Amino acid sequence: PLIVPYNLPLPGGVVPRMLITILGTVKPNANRIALDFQRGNDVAFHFNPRFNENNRRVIVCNTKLDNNWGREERQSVFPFESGKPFKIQVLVEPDHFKVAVNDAHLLQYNHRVKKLNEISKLGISGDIDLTSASYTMI
Ligand X SMILES: CO[C@@H]1[C@@H](n2cc(-c3ccc(Cl)c(F)c3F)nn2)[C@@H](O)[C@@H](CO)O[C@@H]1Cc1cn([C@@H]2CCOC[C@@H]2F)nn1
Q: Annotated binding residues for a beta-D-galactoside, as ranges?
A: 69-75
User: How many Å apart are CA 77 and CA 88, to the nearest integer?
Assistant: 14
Give min distance, CB of 32 to ligand X, in A: 4
The count of other CB atoms within 10 Å of the CB of residue 136 is 9
The count of other CB atoms within 10 Å of the CB of residue 18 is 18
User: How many Å apart are CA 64 and CA 44, to the nearest integer?
Assistant: 7
> Does 81 help bind ligand X (rule: CB under 6 A)?
no
Going residue by residue from 23 to 62, which x/- string records binding to ligand X, judged by CB under 6 A?
---------xxx-----------x-x-----------x-x
Q: Which does 39 bind (CB under 5 to 8 A by kind): ligand X, Cl ion, none?
A: none
By CB under 6 A, the count of residues binding ligand X is: 11
Nearer to ligand X by Cβ, of 6 and 135: the residue is 6
Cβ within 8 Å of residue 17, ≥6 positions away? 92, 137, 138
* SS3 state at 116: helix
> Does 72 help bind ligand X (rule: CB under 6 A)?
yes
Give min distance, CB of 67 to ligand X, in A: 11
Q: Which does 81 bind (CB under 5 to 8 A by kind): ligand X, Cl ion, none?
A: none
> Does 125 help bind ligand X (rule: CB under 6 A)?
yes
User: How many Å apart are CA 51 and CA 93, to the nearest integer?
Assistant: 28
